């Protein structure tokens, strides 16, 4: 016989993911000194649709501890999170929806 | 017609450069006339004269450089012997004839003798 359908998918020619319209990989912040000892406050800028993903995404901006600029993080939005909300992430963050602990 | 190489060699580079310019000017006007005459075979000898002048000028310049590099162990690659690639990489006569002190003692002590079967 010939190579069956499920075997052909591993070659990844026409079976790759369609990622043109993706907003980006959804990840938390990199575990750093502020996260493991205290907390750092971020601001939700917008909640946007992501192609190929049912759940919406949230854009949260944090300040860079070690140099003067802003850092952009892409989170998966929980129910109740709204634009303009402050997000607290770290070991000493409060127990509220949207906080990372 | 045409110039003579042996006559050009007895002239300085300033005279040769001026003569080249005159030949180039003559070539330009002949090409203009070629557009009217049915044929113009005279243009051949002018082109060959320019080639002869360029040959002699190049001979003088290359000869002058050879005097600058005379004796020195490094010369430009265009002034070195061509031969072949393999011949230029082979050991020189001095390198190929080298022997150890042990071997030269044997060669002097016991060389191939000359003998005959007579008596």
């Amino acid at each position: 016989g010939r190579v069956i359908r499920n075997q052909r998918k591993g070659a990844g020619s026409i079976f790759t993911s369609h990622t043109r319209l993706r907003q980006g990989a959804a990840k938390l912040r990199t575990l750093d000194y502020a996260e493991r000892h205290g907390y750092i406050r971020g601001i939700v800028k917008q909640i946007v649709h992501d192609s190929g993903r049912g759940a919406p995404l949230a854009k949260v901006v944090f300040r860079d501890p070690y140099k003067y600029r802003l850092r952009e993080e892409i989170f998966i939005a929980n129910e109740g999170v709204h634009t303009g909300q402050f997000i607290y992430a770290g070991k000493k963050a409060s127990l509220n929806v949207g906080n990372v602990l | 017609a045409g110039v003579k190489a042996y006559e050009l060699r007895t002239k300085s580079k300033e005279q040769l450069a001026s003569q080249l310019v005159d030949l180039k000017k003559e070539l330009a006007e002949l090409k203009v006339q070629k557009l009217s005459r049915p044929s113009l075979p005279k243009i051949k000898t002018v082109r060959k004269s320019i080639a002869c002048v360029l040959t002699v000028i190049n001979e003088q310049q290359r000869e002058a450089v050879r005097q600058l590099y005379k004796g020195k162990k490094y010369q430009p690659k265009d002034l070195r012997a061509k031969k072949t690639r393999a011949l230029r990489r082979a050991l020189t006569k001095f390198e190929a004839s080298q022997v150890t002190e042990k071997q030269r003692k044997k060669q002097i002590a016991f060389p191939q003798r000359k003998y005959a079967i007579k008596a």
Binding site: - | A109, F110, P111, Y115, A116, K118
Partner: protein, 149 residues
């Protein structure tokens, strides 16, 4: 494929044998080349005899041990008994073989006699270079043949 009363034959021609056929069309040509090469070598080596002196040895094996033939070279002991060194013997036209040994007195004595007769029948030109012109003898085997004892 098998018929009649005929011998069983074994002709090994089941490979691509036609690609490896060698016909000696140059048998006559190579004979001329060898003769030309021998002539030009004799002229190159002065009056030297074109071949080295060889000893007489016993052929091995029970089948061929009744005969004597020519060996590669004289042993170190045979050369020493003749009254000269191995290094000088090589430069004078005598073959020396270091791996052959002497265990038979008859063979040892005969090879000693061959070396002595050879030395008395040759002339060694001095290193000065005067070089008197002597006739070249092209063979030392014919001059010193080997006879069955």
């Amino acid at each position: 494929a098998i018929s009649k009363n005929l011998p069983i034959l074994k002709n090994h021609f089941r490979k691509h044998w036609q690609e490896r056929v060698k016909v000696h069309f140059d048998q006559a040509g190579k004979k001329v080349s060898r003769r030309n090469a021998r002539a030009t070598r004799a002229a190159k080596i002065a009056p030297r005899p074109l071949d080295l002196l060889r000893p007489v040895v016993r052929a091995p094996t029970v089948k061929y041990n009744r005969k004597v033939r020519a060996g590669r070279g004289f042993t170190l002991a045979e050369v020493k008994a003749a009254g000269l060194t191995a290094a000088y013997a090589r430069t004078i036209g005598i073959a020396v073989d270091h791996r052959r040994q002497n265990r038979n007195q008859e063979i040892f004595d005969a090879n000693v006699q061959r070396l002595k007769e050879y030395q008395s029948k040759i002339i060694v030109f001095p290193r000065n270079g005067k070089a008197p012109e002597a006739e070249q003898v092209l063979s030392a085997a014919a001059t010193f043949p080997i006879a069955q004892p």
